[PDB]
Amino acid sequence: AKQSMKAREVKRVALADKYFAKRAELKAIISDVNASDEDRWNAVLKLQTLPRDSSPSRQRNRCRQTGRPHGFLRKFGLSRIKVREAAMRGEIPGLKKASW
Amino acid sequence: NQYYGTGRRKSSAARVFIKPGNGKIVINQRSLEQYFGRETARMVVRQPLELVDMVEKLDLYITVKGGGISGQAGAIRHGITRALMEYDESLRSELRKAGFVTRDARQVERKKVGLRKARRRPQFSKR
Amino acid sequence: PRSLKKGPFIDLHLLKKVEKAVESGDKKPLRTWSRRSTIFPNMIGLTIAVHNGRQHVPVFVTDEMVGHKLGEFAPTRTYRGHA
Amino acid sequence: RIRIRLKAFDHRLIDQATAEIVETAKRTGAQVRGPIPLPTRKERFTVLISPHVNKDARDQYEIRTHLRLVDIVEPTEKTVDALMRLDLAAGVDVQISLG
Amino acid sequence: GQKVHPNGIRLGIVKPWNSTWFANTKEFADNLDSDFKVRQYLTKELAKASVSRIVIERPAKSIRVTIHTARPGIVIGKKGEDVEKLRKVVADIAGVPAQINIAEVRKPELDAKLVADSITSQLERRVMFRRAMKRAVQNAMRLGAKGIKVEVSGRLGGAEIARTEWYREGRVPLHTLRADIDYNTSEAHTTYGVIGVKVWIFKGEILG
Amino acid sequence: VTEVEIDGVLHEYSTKEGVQEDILEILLNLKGLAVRVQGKDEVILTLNKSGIGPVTAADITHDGDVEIVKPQHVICHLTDENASISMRIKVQRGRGYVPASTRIHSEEDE
Amino acid sequence: PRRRVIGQRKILPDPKFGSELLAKFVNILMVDGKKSTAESIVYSALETLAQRSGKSELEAFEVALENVRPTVEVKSRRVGGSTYQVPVEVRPVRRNALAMRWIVEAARKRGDKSMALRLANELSDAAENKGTAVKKREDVHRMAEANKAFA
RNA sequence: AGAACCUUACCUGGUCUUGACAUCCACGGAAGUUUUCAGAGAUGAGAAUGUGCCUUCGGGAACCGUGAGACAGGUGCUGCAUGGCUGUCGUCAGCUCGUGUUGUGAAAUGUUGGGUUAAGUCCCGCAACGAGCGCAACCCUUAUCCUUUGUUGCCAGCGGUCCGGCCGGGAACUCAAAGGAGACUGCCAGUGAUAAACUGGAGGAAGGUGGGGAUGACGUCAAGUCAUCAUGCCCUUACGACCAGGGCUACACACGUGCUACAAUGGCGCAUACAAAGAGAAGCGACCUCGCGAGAGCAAGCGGACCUCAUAAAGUGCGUCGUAGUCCGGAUUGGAGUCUGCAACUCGACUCCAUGAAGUCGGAAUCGCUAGUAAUCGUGGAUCAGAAUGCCACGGUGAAUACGU
């Protein structure tokens, strides 16, 4: 991936980190069946006001080395291609070719 | 006094105990007719006994885990055979002839990348 | 469709604009991009030029259009025929 | 009783660790329960090995996380403390838990 | 892309791992990233120093690095001056207490990676690739390798049509798992393009 | 005691910040040490201490299977309160007398 | 195959009557590895058939089979420009199989409602020497007769 | 290994130009923290706090601000400049070399020949003698046994029982790993060239490579990939960067791969049995309560052989339907809704009620499979907020056939 994309991702992450407490609270408020209608409405509107990049469902998991969006693995934080390389080199602990 | 043999076939693992008695079979605290609804299964569990006339002579307590029905039955049979071998040690030849001493090593073949199954290749086309 | 408990959706800005229009009593078309906005009872009578991706297409709101959204009356694709 | 959960990727290493722990226990205290092997986690992974395209081309890796459950029945004064200074070999996550 | 990686196929048997730690699914990715970082840093730093293998090993929230290098003197510098310097930066990279050890590589002609690096260097300073390859092979043989292979590929002698050439000497069994096959690779960033250098060095078979 | 590893040191003939005995004196006083391991045959201890006063052998942060049987064996005499010392000792097990010259090339583990 | 002939795999006799042939038939009948259902169906067929013709369950079945077994089948050599169908004496193991298969096919075809019932009907037909399987057998024989010149 | 936004590379507008991302000085300000109006948003304008590590005080390192340029940036072009990685013939048994010899020489010989083998496998011969890479073996897994260790796993024999291994307990058995044993044509007979082997049988859990995987020789296709990454002309107030909306989901049509069907070896209803292998902390979420249901509420147990996902389904028994475009089939569409998510219009999944297309086994032709295989039945996992009939795994039931070349 590009540098720019990576930067964007980072920014998104930062935003998420920032706005988590508020956003979560808002969500809770919206959910809460034992609450006022007007309040709920306000909460809904409030959420809209907050930045979009603040959402965690905005950020894409990219490879930590290359930034490749596809072929990702969570345990390693790496795209398949890089993961394989790591494995070959001995750089991922415990990981070896499996047969059964 | 109770004699014993381990049973194993597919992913089943039977625990057959042989005792002297009248010939009542219990599988996981249930009768042979209750546990195995299938006739074939019943037949397979009775096979070894039929082969060596000790159906009326000995009771057997069984507990089996894993696999399905047929596999389980097979495992049980194997266990029984083992028990018999342990107990008499002069019926071995007959058992061998029958083909019951043999652990049936047929496991399910693993699925292989590329293929839809163990061997089914996906539909090919030149064009 | 949207959940009943959440209510109807309208863009805040759009709503504000509508309110302003109502206050005025004017009938100049309001150019809008909020295709996702639901139409409201108070919006009846107003012309509201909804974006279709390319251009703003005028939509005179009617009593029948209320439950619907603005994007329903502003078709995006432009297919005449194959021959 | 002190339950001890040894976890590692290398099995030999884990075994070595376990033995060491037992030794540590047995000199100071008395009645070490024993090194009980729990089930191993075989966390598998498939990946496409081509840079671009070839889907049937694949490598299937795995990480075998081994578990060793060591238990100590009588925690004395001398025994429990002995583990503080007694760190184990690297690449072996231990997890002691009294009661 | 025919061949399996010779190190990678043998990690369970005759070859060991480089990063040697346990971690749960939570902290594993992060750890990996850290390793990548530190290793990268080390490579950048100790380019002039002949470095073969960085072995990272982190127990108890503290990182233990082990640098295998042919000449410790240039990595250490004055006794505990350069190493110390390296350590703090390593720690920073990690975010934990660092500890650097330096293993001295006996026979750098038999270490494959080092050889590859040397070859790359030679290529960069505009020697005849073939002569370099020969030197690499010969030297290893002299030193007591049971066998060695080296391969170089692409834009050889700045030629328009790229090709690969390779020199083997002795025996280099790759299908045999118990064979100690030190494999490694490098890349010469020449004026005409990259020239990739592979080298396999067969130390001998392990019996267990 | 076989190998002693002090931090911020170049050779054994240097000197250190905040201590009395010089480094050859420290190595002699460590050569006199009396250790009793039980399980392993090669262990690594740790000695960390700051503050004004002597450094006994009882200040080594022991593991479980090592027993230091001389809690009045003196090693250092720390005089500066801003001085620290962090050595990592290595204790093998053998017999006879094996000296540094012969153990200069005998050691295989690089 | 080219390289090696192999020994036929072991087949267990059915639990009801203790017969290999019966078991084989059941297997043939079976679809999607649902053996049990198939065996039940077979049993049903037998019972009805037994009721109809008297005799035993097994004996009747055997008799039925006998009327649909082919002495001779044909195969395509085609050495010339046009194809020549050549007769060949069909071996004991194979003949039995073929008849069973034909019967099954007939059953599948048949317009009656339940599978078992259809099977029974087919069996009856075979016994009497009319029906579909028998016809097929005749056809097979006829072809062979026609091409008897080749041997 | 998952396009609503994001992803995104494309289009439409709105914007930025040493820049979203780095390094460097100059000099303005501690960073940051909170909040306000306009705007689709990007951005463009306001109100509160702070001055930490050190100064013969021309100031500093982190982190914002402005201008200059040096530069950044490019998923822009060339895979016919490349590395790396990948497919492929083909897991096909081949491909070579050194020295010797033959030939003016290209080359040959070895490597052919008699047998044999899965195998350039092995023997015997022989102007060859040797060697290497490969065909084999070493590795994982599966099939039998033994030793060790027994909780969170087990219950044979003992006592107690709420008839639940639940609780005293027991270490047997299963199981769990760790370490050993075992299979080598080793033993027997015959055939064979005094052979390599082959054919049978004995034992054995396993027999002739036991089953499966990993392992892919020299090379071939200027095969694929400059959009993973790296790397040897072009853009640099734009072929770079930010934003909102749209598109990648379009639809006369053609092809590929799948799922579901066309029914009775079945559909529906009620009862009821037997798995394996996995995942789980911004996570899996019992029980209980409410909801026809998707779910909702409350909320334990659990980084997990313990708790949760989690009822396996086919099956079995009893009933019903009786060959109908049907109590087959479920597309399509209407209504109403649940959850995720700032957000389900374009364009999510799932639920309920209604609706009930085509389809009655498919032309020419064409694919897979030799055994726990095909066929069929469910189960799990990765990516993942949500979003699989795909992919990768797991067990259940479980065939037919191989005369032969």
Q: How far apart are CA E112 and CA E150, in angstroms?
A: 9
For residue F59 the two structure tokens come to 């200040």
Distance CA A16, CA D82 (A): 45
A 10 A CB-CB count for B109 gives 9
Pairing of strands F43-44, E179-189: unpaired
Give me the phi and psi of B86, to 5 degrees please: -60, -45
The separation between the first and the last C-alpha atoms of chain A, rounded to the nearest angstrom, is 36
Residues of chain F neighbouring E104 (CB-CB closer than 8 A): 110
Please tell me whether residue E60 adopts helix, strand or coil conformation.
coil
Q: How many structural domains does chain B have?
A: 1
> What is the number of other CB atoms lying within 10 angstroms of the CB of residue F49?
19
Q: Is D94 on the interface with F (CB under 8 A)?
A: no
AA letter at E139: N
Strand H contact with B40 (CB < 7 A):
yes
Q: Find, among E80, E137, E70, the residue nearest to E103 by Cα.
A: E70
Distance CA E90, CA E97 (A): 9
For strand H, which nucleotides have at least one atom less than 7 Å from a protein CB? 1-2, 5-9, 11-12, 20-21, 33-34, 39-42, 72-75, 79, 81-90, 118, 131-145, 149-152, 155-157, 173-179, 199, 203-206, 210-220, 222, 224-232, 240-247, 250-252, 255-258, 264-266, 273-282, 296-297, 303-305, 312-317, 322-323, 337-346, 366-376, 382-386, 391-405
Report CA torsion sign: B26, B29, B32, B35.
Answer: negative
| Other Cβ atoms within 10 Å of E119 Cβ, number | 24
Cα–Cα distance for residue pair G30/G22, rounded to 1 Å: 12
User: Is B114 part of the contact surface with chain D (CB cutoff 8 Å)?
Assistant: yes
Rounded Cα distance, E107 and E142, in Å: 11
d(CA G17, CA G15): 6
CB B55 within 8 A of CB B23: yes
CATH architecture of G20-147: Orthogonal Bundle (1.10)
Round to a whole number and report the distance in Å from the CA of E200 to the C1' of H110: 29
Cα D37–chain centre separation: 9
Contacts of D58 in chain B (CB under 8 A): 113-114
Nearest of E170, E136, E175, E171 to residue E152 by alpha carbon: E136
Residue A27 CB partners (closer than 8 Å, separation 6+): A47
Chain D residue at shortest CA distance from A96: D61
Q: Strand, helix or coil at A25? A: helix
Asked if D46 lies within 8 A of B114 by C-beta distance, the reply is no
Contact between E196 and E187 (Cβ < 8 Å) = yes
Cβ of E57 within 8 Å of Cβ of D50? The answer is no
Q: How far apart are CA F52 and CA F6, in angstroms?
A: 19
Experimentally determined by:
cryo-EM
Residue E195 CB closer than 7 angstroms to strand H? yes
Distance of alpha carbon F74 from the chain centroid: 11
Q: Where does D1-99 sit in CATH, by number?
A: 3.30.70.600
Each as own residue / partner, the long-range contacts of residues A54-60 (CB below 8 Å, 24 or more positions apart, any chain) are: A54/A15, A54/A16, A54/A18, A54/A19, A54/A23, A55/A16, A55/A23, A56/A16, A58/A12, A58/A16, A59/A9, A59/A12, A59/A13, A59/A16, A60/A9
User: Does residue B34 approach strand H to less than 7 Å at its CB?
Assistant: no
How far apart, in whole angstroms, are the C-alpha atoms of residue D24 and residue D34? 13
Say if residues A50 and A22 touch (Cβ distance below 8 Å): yes
Neighbours of G144 (CB within 10 A): 21
Selected residue of B110, B113, B121 to mutate for chain D interface (largest D Cβ count, 10 A): B113
Alpha helices in G1-151 (DSSP H): 20-29, 35-53, 57-66, 92-109, 115-128, 132-146
What is the rounded distance in angstroms from the CA atom of residue E172 to the CA atom of residue E201? 7
Cβ burial of E112 (10 Å; 0-12, 13-18, 19+) is buried
Domain boundaries, chain D: 1-99
CA distance B127 to B122: 14
Rounded distance, CA B125 to CA E173, Å? 39
Read off the tokens for E175.
Answer: 């299908």
Residue B64 three-state SS: strand
Domains of chain F: 1-110 (2.170.120.12)
**Test mutation, E7, E10, E19, chain A, max A CBs within 10 A:** E19
Query: In terms of residue numbers, what domain contains B84?
Result: 1-127
Q: Which residues of E touch D65 (CB under 8 A)?
A: 22
Say if CB A53 and CB A12 are below 8 A apart.
yes
Between CA E42 and CA G49 the distance in angstroms is: 87
Scan for tokens 């003197």, then name that residue: E73
The structural domains of chain E, with segments of one domain joined by +, span 16-106, 107-206
Residue numbers in D 7-36, CB below 7 Å of strand H: 7, 11-12, 14-15, 33-36
Whether residue C38 contacts residue C9, with contact meaning beta carbons closer than 8 Å, is answered with yes
A contacts of E36 (beta carbons < 8 Å): 64-65, 91
